[PDB]
Amino acid sequence: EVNSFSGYLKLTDNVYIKNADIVEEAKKVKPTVVVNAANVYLKHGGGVAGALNKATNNAMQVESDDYIATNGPLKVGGSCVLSGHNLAKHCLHVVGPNVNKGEDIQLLKSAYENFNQHEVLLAPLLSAGIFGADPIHSLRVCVDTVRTNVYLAVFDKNLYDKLVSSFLE
Ligand SMILES: CC(C)[C@H](Nc1ncnc2[nH]c(S(C)(=O)=O)cc12)c1ccc2c(c1)S(=O)(=O)CCC2
């Protein structure tokens, strides 16, 4: 079956959320698009990007190095479409701002705007974790910006519960 997301809670008409590991969701669902929380040189060294690369047995990193050699780095707030390998038809590599490294939080709107070129996506919460954005603010920007159908996988029950409570205020 196509895009068989299960156990998500619908927040708005086009935003759904689950307490789940995006790598395990991608292997089960085989979505048309999985979003990677990338950096501008597509170096998948840890966190979500490192885990998605490891699940492709490093094929995503080799493909990413070839893209950067020909095209140069991405900009913060930008994206590129590459192969999904065994995880999806396509991977949309999106660069959210890293607030812990001084990047502008306003670019989080530009980052989520890349999702609107794809009808259905499996995604992480952009700029959260060690990128330093406030995760409740990242969910609000996602809900206000994305107009296509996005399934957010957030792999922490404590954070998932705080995000659903904040949305339902
Ligand atoms: C907030 C946090 C619970 C979330 N983590 C995750 N969310 C969803 N699926 C996950 N799998 C794994 S794993 C066990 O394969 O490493 C982690 C994970 C997350 C969301 C966004 C970002 C990060 C982390 S980061 O990697 O710190 C920096 C880039 C932006």
Written overview of the protein:
This is Papain-like protease nsp3. Residues 2-169 form the Macro domain. It is found in: Host endoplasmic reticulum membrane. The structure is a monomer. The protein has 169 residues and is an alpha/beta fold. It has a single domain (3-167), classed as Leucine Aminopeptidase, subunit E, domain 1 (3-Layer(aba) Sandwich). It has helices spanning 22-29, 47-55, 59-71, 107-113, 135-145, 157-167, and strands spanning 9-10, 15-18, 33-37, 79-83, 90-94, 120-123, 149-153. The strands form two sheets. The chain has a four-stranded mixed β-sheet, with helices on one face. Strands 3-5-4 form a three-stranded mixed β-sheet. It is globular and about 45 Å long. The site of the ligand CC(C)[C@H](Nc1ncnc2[nH]c(S(C)(=O)=O)cc12)c1ccc2c(c1)S(=O)(=O)CCC2 has 18 residues, from helix 1 and helix 2.
CATH architecture: 3-Layer(aba) Sandwich
Number of helices: 6
The number of E-state strands comes to 7
Q: Can you summarize the main beta sheet?
A: 4 strands, mixed
Structural class: alpha/beta
Strand % is 15-25%
* SSE arrangement, N to C: EEHEHHEEHEHEH
Number of domains: 1
List the topology elements.
Elements: E1 9-10, E2 15-18, H1 22-29, E3 33-37, H2 47-55, H3 59-71, E4 79-83, E5 90-94, H4 107-113, E6 120-123, H5 135-145, E7 149-153, H6 157-167
Helix pairs in contact: 4-5, 5-6
The protein binds the ligand CC(C)[C@H](Nc1ncnc2[nH]c(S(C)(=O)=O)cc12)c1ccc2c(c1)S(=O)(=O)CCC2.
The site of the ligand CC(C)[C@H](Nc1ncnc2[nH]c(S(C)(=O)=O)cc12)c1ccc2c(c1)S(=O)(=O)CCC2 has 18 residues, from helix 1 and helix 2.
Catalytic activity: Thiol-dependent hydrolysis of ester, thioester, amide, peptide and isopeptide bonds formed by the C-terminal Gly of ubiquitin (a 76-residue protein attached to proteins as an intracellular targeting signal)
Organism: Severe acute respiratory syndrome coronavirus 2 (2019-nCoV)
Subunit structure: May form homohexamers. Interacts with N protein.
